[PDB]
């Protein structure tokens with residue numbers, strides 16, 4: 001029997017980051033994550049402020065920001081706290097444990113110092129998680145494992161997806177869920193976040209494929225939709241974000257019955 | 258049916274960046290790539306200068322460099338030109354095409370502006386290559402596809418590896434080879450670069466596994482060894498690099514007959 005986001009937030013085995021997210025999802029009636037791959041910090045902050053009320057999460061793309069500074073991230077965190085959303089950095093970590101540890105904690109970006117959530121590919125084996133968690137656990141962070149991908153020709157299928165689920169299960173102190181196209185775990189303590197979402201059928205010219213909020217939340221049993229271009233390329237970004245929120249939310253309610 | 262690096266540089270279907278690399282390998286008697294995952298620009302540049310004569314390539318880790326600037330990369334280019342080595346950025350690109358295009362071209366790092374070579378994971382499908390290609394093709398860059406990984410529990414096996422080989426074949430205007438543990442393609446135009454190499458048996462505490470240069474180059478038929486810690490952790494990094502160079506080069510010569 002399907003549990004509400006609010007109830008899931010209270011599960012004995014829930015990770016604190018997942019609980020915080022689930023609570024604000026229920027409070028705000030939003031299971032939308034905005035993906036903002038903008039080139040200017042000012043753009044990022046403007047979008048975060050304007051759309052913050054409509055979202056549960058903001059997916060940043062630090063590697064694309066032309067004018068990144070740590071002061072920008074300080075201000076973003078202030079917005080996140082005010083509007084109540086989490087920060088999820090997009091970078092798809094995908095290296096041996098020793099290297100990913102450094103990529104997560106260090107450099108100019110210091111991702112672990114401001115991202116509530118990160119995502120990682122499972123292709124390197126479990127060392128990728130072990131490396132990340134050595135940084136993430138002290139900093140009270142969570143991780144999502146990429147169990148499936150939305151793009152044409154994805155190899156994240158079959159036994160690969162099953163491996164991701166096992167890895168998650170075995171690292172539940174740090175791993176809080178999946179990037180996936182559907183529900184892949186039966187355990188309610190895990191979140192499912194699904195990119196490749198737009199209201200209309202289609203794709204892009206570089207292998208992205210889209211499904212609707214109703215399809216992925218309602219039929220496929222995911223929790224949260226990740227939407228970038230469907231919102232950002234709209235004339236009215238506020239209205240677009242509202243449209244996606246209402247879609248995703250109603251699909252969730254329906255499933256919940 | 259084995260050809261020298263110098264002869265391979267002349268193959269009809271060879272990419273210009275590959276030919277450049279194969280010529281300097283032959284000239285300098287080196288098939289060693291130094292992986293320099295240091296936190297400081299001064300260390301990176303000192304290593305590049307001192308070890309430059311001993312290496313065919315320097316693998317940078319821009320995501321870990323605390324004091325990155327584009328001026329640092331300008332100086333590195335100068336050293337690469339002087340000592341004759343290629344610059345290979347480590348970042349293991351692993352996203353949809355539209356996103357990796359921006360990650361490669363833009364942000365603070367502007368990777369495509371200074372890296373001869375990049376590597377990508379094949380998990381997203383061929384859009385990952387198409388996105389990178391749209392940026393790197395006119396710059397005379399090349400890309401390596403991650404066909405196998407050196408770490409424990411790697412999922413880059415079997416059909417996944419085969420998919421990487423097919424993807425390379427289908428994008429040979431831009432894909433110049435593989436990150437792999439062994440020869441994966443029979444086509445001599447493709448380069449095989451193998452990480453997880455040390456003179457001594459072992460591993461690390463985060464899933465890395467090591468094999469020797471003699472094993473990797475001599476028995477497994479790879480072209481280039483990628484060595485980080487085996488060199489970087491030595492007291493005398495130059496002497497270490499020389500040891501690795503001689504091992505890899507003589508293993509190559511021996512297979513050549």
Ligand SMILES: *C(=N)c1cc(=O)[nH]c(=O)n1[C@@H]1O[C@H](COP(=O)(O)O)[C@@H](O)[C@H]1O
Pocket residue numbers: 035037090092119148149150151179195196197208226227228229230352353356
């Ligand atoms: C990573 N979150 C990811 C994984 C995936 O399989 N597919 C995918 O699109 N993403 C990322 O999500 C957004 C989607 O943006 P659009 O709605 O604009 O297509 C983008 O950040 C991808 O990198």
Ligand SMILES: *C(=N)c1cc(=O)[nH]c(=O)n1[C@@H]1O[C@H](COP(=O)(O)O)[C@@H](O)[C@H]1O
Pocket residue numbers: 095096099292294347349376405406407408436452453454465483484485486487
């Ligand atoms: C990526 N080049 C890669 C792929 C892989 O399967 N294994 C692997 O180690 N690498 C990277 O190569 C260096 C090896 O460094 P050490 O010699 O210090 O182990 C490493 O930093 C990985 O990121």
